[PDB]
Amino acid sequence: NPFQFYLTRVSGVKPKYNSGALHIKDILSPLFGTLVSSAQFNYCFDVDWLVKQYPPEFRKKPILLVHGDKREAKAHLHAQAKPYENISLCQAKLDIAFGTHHTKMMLLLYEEGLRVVIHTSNLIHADWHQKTQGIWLSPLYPRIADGTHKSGESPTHFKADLISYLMAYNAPSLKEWIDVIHKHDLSETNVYLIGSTPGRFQGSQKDNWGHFRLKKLLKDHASSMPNAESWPVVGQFSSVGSLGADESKWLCSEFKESMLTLGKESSSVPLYLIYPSVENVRTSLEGYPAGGSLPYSIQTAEKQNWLHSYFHKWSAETSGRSNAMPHIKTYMRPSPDFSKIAWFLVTSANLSKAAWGALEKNGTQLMIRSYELGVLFLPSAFGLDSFKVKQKFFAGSQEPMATFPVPYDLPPELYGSKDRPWIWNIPYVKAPDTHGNMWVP
Ligand SMILES: O=P(O)(O)c1ccc(Nc2c(-c3ccccc3)nc3ccccn23)cc1
Numbered sequence: 001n002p003f004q005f006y007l008t009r010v011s012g013v014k015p016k017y018n019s020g021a022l023h024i025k026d027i028l029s030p031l032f033g034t035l036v037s038s039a040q041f042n043y044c045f046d047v048d049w050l051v052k053q054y055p056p057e058f059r060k061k062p063i064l065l066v067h068g069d070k071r072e073a074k075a076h077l078h079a080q081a082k083p084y085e086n087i088s089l090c091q092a093k094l095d096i097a098f099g100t101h102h103t104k105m106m107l108l109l110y111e112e113g114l115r116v117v118i119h120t121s122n123l124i125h126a127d128w129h130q131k132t133q134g135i136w137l138s139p140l141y142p143r144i145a146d147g148t149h150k151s152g153e154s155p156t157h158f159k160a161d162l163i164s165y166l167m168a169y170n171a172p173s174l175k176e177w178i179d180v181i182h183k184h185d186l187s188e189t190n191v192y193l194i195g196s197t198p199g200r201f202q203g204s205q206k207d208n209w210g211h212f213r214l215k216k217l218l219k220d221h222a223s224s225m226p227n228a229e230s231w232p233v234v235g236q237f238s239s240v241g242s243l244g245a246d247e248s249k250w251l252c253s254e255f256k257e258s259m260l261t262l263g264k265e266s267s268s269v270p271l272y273l274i275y276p277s278v279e280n281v282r283t284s285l286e287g288y289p290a291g292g293s294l295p296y297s298i299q300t301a302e303k304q305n306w307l308h309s310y311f312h313k314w315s316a317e318t319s320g321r322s323n324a325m326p327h328i329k330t331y332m333r334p335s336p337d338f339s340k341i342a343w344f345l346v347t348s349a350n351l352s353k354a355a356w357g358a359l360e361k362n363g364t365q366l367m368i369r370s371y372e373l374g375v376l377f378l379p380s381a382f383g384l385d386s387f388k389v390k391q392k393f394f395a396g397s398q399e400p401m402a403t404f405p406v407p408y409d410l411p412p413e414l415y416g417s418k419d420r421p422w423i424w425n426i427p428y429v430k431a432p433d434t435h436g437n438m439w440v441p
Pocket residue numbers: 012013014015016
């Protein structure tokens with residue numbers, strides 16, 4: 001397949017639903033390359049667990065942890081890392097309040113080349129155990145020969161765009177990785193990078209990041225079709241920020257407007273949001289503890305009850321993962337009958353202004369609080385007008401280079417009248433979960 005989009009392994013499901021899924025130990029195995037060094041961009045790290053995921057023969061190779069922790073949290077991460085002299089740390093600057101470093105990415109330097117992994121899992125055991133998570137695996141990028149002058153650039157501009165993303169950190173450890181990337185040929189890359197970095201972007205930088213980056217790519221590299229107003233937008237996420245007192249403040253104004261863009265010419269578009277209900281969490285493989293990875297607070301939720309009328313249950317029979325709670329985030333543009341999609345994005349970005357950006361200064365400036373990263377699959381980058389949707393995620397299609405593996409069921413199913421969104425800081429004591437327990441925060 002050309003897409004190289006994988007789910008993580010889920011413990012406990014039938015083997016047929018893990019055939020072609022990847023565990024972290026698979027990604028780091030010597031079969032993927034002879035490791036020289038690596039960078040692990042993430043939010044949360046269990047360092048002892050992380051080192052054990054590397055092959056024994058690679059556990060002393062240099063590792064850079066790129067994180068956003070401050071104050072006592074930074075001290076704790078440093079203390080986790082101090083027993084391993086091969087581990088260095090980069091604290092990503094977060095100079096706007098309430099910002100986070102959420103990007104999940106591995107840079108893997110090998111004797112044979114370079115690989116980039118952009119994915120959705122924290123580097124802790126629980127995120128790779130029984131959750132639905134997404135992975136994009138780059139090709140093995142070969143080194144450009146000493147003395148050869150070539151760009152190594154792809155038609156999607158991925159190499160320069162990944163360097164631009166890393167440049168935003170202004171970090172010496174990441175300039176070293178920028179120089180590694182310069183020395184490699186990334187021209188086979190068929191996805192577009194969509195990043196968020198903290199800042200206030202105007203003018204020539206407005207389109208670099210967040211939802212304006214998405215808009216710009218959709219304007220330049222997608223085509224509008226007849227009855228485009230009938231093609232829904234689907235967003236699927238594991239956390240919800242404060243979106244405002246009604247849908248016009250952000251969600252259905254600037255955010256939906258960027259996501260419905262197609263092509264360069266100048267809304268009734270249905271918007272489906274997929275987010276686990278309480279019942280989804282209760283009956284999940286993990287039970288109520290899965291809700292510790294579904295941060296949606298009651299203080300935020302009670303200020304935006306209008307939002308929950310957009311909410312659809314998690315369902316993933318197609319991948320055997322209805323009970324594997326989602327920590328993947330995805331956004332896509334299906335056709336009215338959900339048989340095709342115009343594009344697909346897998347990203348770290350949840351449904352929040354901090355992640356996607358909020359317009360300021362009379363619509364002239366996009367303000368972003370966090371670091372995020374995802375990859376966009378556009379049909380034009382594969383020589384296609386649209387992607388067919390794969391009927392069964394792990395099955396064998398007649399045209400695998402069309403046929404995009406959407407990991408959950410379409411159409412999404414609206415919450416029922418008795419469903420409620422998972423809210424992680426109130427108790428649930430009416431019905432026990434799959435392990436016999438209640439939820440008492
Ligand atoms: O639907 P199928 O293809 O007929 C089918 C496939 C597998 C099984 N049994 C089964 C399971 C399992 C069964 C239920 C739920 C979770 C895991 N795990 C293993 C591992 C090795 C061998 C068998 N295993 C039964 C029927």
